[PDB]
Amino acid sequence: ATGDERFYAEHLMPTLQGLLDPESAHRLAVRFTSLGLLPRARFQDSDMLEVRVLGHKFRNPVGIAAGFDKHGEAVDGLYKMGFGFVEIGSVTPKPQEGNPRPRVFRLPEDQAVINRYGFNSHGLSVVEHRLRARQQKQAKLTEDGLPLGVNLGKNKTSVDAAEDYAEGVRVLGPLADYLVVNVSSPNTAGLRSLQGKAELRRLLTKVLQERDGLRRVHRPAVLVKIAPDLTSQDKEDIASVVKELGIDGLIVTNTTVSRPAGLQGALRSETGGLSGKPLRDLSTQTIREMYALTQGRVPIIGVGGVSSGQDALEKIRAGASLVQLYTALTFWGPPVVGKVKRELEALLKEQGFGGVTDAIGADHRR
Numbered sequence: 001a002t003g004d005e006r007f008y009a010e011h012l013m014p015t016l017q018g019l020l021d022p023e024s025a026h027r028l029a030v031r032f033t034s035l036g037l038l039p040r041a042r043f044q045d046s047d048m049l050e051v052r053v054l055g056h057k058f059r060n061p062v063g064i065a066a067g068f069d070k071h072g073e074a075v076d077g078l079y080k081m082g083f084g085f086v087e088i089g090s091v092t093p094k095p096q097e098g099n100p101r102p103r104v105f106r107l108p109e110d111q112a113v114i115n116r117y118g119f120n121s122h123g124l125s126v127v128e129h130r131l132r133a134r135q136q137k138q139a140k141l142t143e144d145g146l147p148l149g150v151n152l153g154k155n156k157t158s159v160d161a162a163e164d165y166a167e168g169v170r171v172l173g174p175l176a177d178y179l180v181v182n183v184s185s186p187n188t189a190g191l192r193s194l195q196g197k198a199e200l201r202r203l204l205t206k207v208l209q210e211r212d213g214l215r216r217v218h219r220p221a222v223l224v225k226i227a228p229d230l231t232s233q234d235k236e237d238i239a240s241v242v243k244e245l246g247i248d249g250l251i252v253t254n255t256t257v258s259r260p261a262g263l264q265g266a267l268r269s270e271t272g273g274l275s276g277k278p279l280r281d282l283s284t285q286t287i288r289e290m291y292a293l294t295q296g297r298v299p300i301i302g303v304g305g306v307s308s309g310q311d312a313l314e315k316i317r318a319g320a321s322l323v324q325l326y327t328a329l330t331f332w333g334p335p336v337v338g339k340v341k342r343e344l345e346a347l348l349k350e351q352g353f354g355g356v357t358d359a360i361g362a363d364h365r366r
């Protein structure tokens, strides 16, 4: 395990990344993953890593964040990597190209990425048919503790944002264990304004009504994914709305439009969302605040700068029931998944926790 980890991180990934533009490297990764061209996921998930949340069993708490598999092309390969859950998307109602290239930038000195993809999406119909082709295979995976999330976006030219999300609920809701109302992309104009109170309550009411109209076996959990750049007022309002409406959970956080002091990469001043190590603590602190504002009663999926067991446990202790990563995979490759899981298990034992469940929100009880 540690053999593969070292070779991937120290030699293979830096070599491959030095040969390819970042978007090409992304596209090839999706293709390789969809073909199962992957190292052995050596790590056996232990009972200590199981989590029950959102109406589902999760064999382990480490998921792939939205953005890697935007169009649902690599789901089975991502489970083969050892992820305990997979989130696809964002998916928009109609197909759209996204922003002009280049739109992805590597900051290897910062272990960070900046992206401005702009919701490049195959669209709901294409993704629906892709997920339908493996719908019963997914039902068995979910029963076995490997749930699927679908992240919903909106088209660039839409006039009625709530209608775009409602279309996504109707089309992909029946194929998902959970849905994500992504109101926090930094790369669609006006999108993050949907996080404001009046707009959010109206939007989320419509989303929940649509979800509630699906047949029981086809009725997903609904989560809201938020930015790391919210004001204190915005956070208080989101918390209020989520509790009022009975939203099932939060994903905390998307990428940041901030540029923390100390970034070294030449491309630091590119427009887009920043991910990876510089986002880590900003995300952990957003988890911590959202957990407090919701009384620990709203499950949180914690995301932003996770590349180790320690990073995962810090998010869990701050309030996350589950975590996701993406950017670390770009530097470490597939062995990062088993690395995080092994390190997390070790730390849980070292800190006296019986399993992940016992550590959720543990910092708030100090």
Ligand SMILES: CCn1c(CO)nn(-c2cc3c([C@@H](C)C(F)(F)F)cn(-c4ccccc4C)c(=O)c3cc2F)c1=O
Residues within 6 Å of the ligand: 013, 016, 017, 020, 021, 022, 023, 024, 025, 026, 027, 028, 029, 030, 032, 033, 037, 038, 039, 068, 104, 105, 106, 113, 326, 329, 330, 333, 334
């Ligand atoms: C943010 C966009 N973005 C970038 C650029 O910022 N990189 N990236 C990415 C690339 C890769 C690559 C490429 C280098 C490939 F494909 F060109 F080699 C291989 N592999 C891999 C290795 C060994 C075996 C099986 C795979 C899939 C990965 O896991 C992987 C993951 C990734 F997230 C990615 O999504």
Ligand SMILES: Cc1cc2nc3c(=O)[nH]c(=O)nc-3n(C[C@H](O)[C@H](O)[C@H](O)COP(=O)(O)O)c2cc1C
Residues within 6 Å of the ligand: 065, 066, 067, 068, 070, 089, 090, 104, 113, 115, 117, 119, 151, 182, 225, 253, 254, 255, 275, 276, 277, 279, 303, 304, 305, 306, 324, 325, 326, 327, 328
């Ligand atoms: C290239 C790229 C594309 C992304 N696209 C999406 C997206 O379509 N929808 C979404 O909710 N989040 C998207 N994200 C955000 C990630 O899901 C995640 O919230 C963020 O990158 C923080 O995690 P990380 O530091 O582990 O990458 C994307 C991130 C990256 C790097």
Ligand SMILES: O=C(O)c1cc(=O)[nH]c(=O)[nH]1
Residues within 6 Å of the ligand: 067, 090, 115, 116, 117, 118, 119, 120, 182, 184, 185, 186, 187, 254, 255, 273
């Ligand atoms: O498509 C993108 O640009 C994208 C969407 C999102 O939600 N987050 C992100 O960092 N990029």
Ligand SMILES: [Cl-]
Residues within 6 Å of the ligand: 022, 104, 105, 106, 107
């Ligand atoms: Cl680059």
Ligand SMILES: [Cl-]
Residues within 6 Å of the ligand: 174, 175, 218
């Ligand atoms: Cl169906």
Ligand SMILES: [Cl-]
Residues within 6 Å of the ligand: 257, 270, 271, 272, 273
């Ligand atoms: Cl920006």
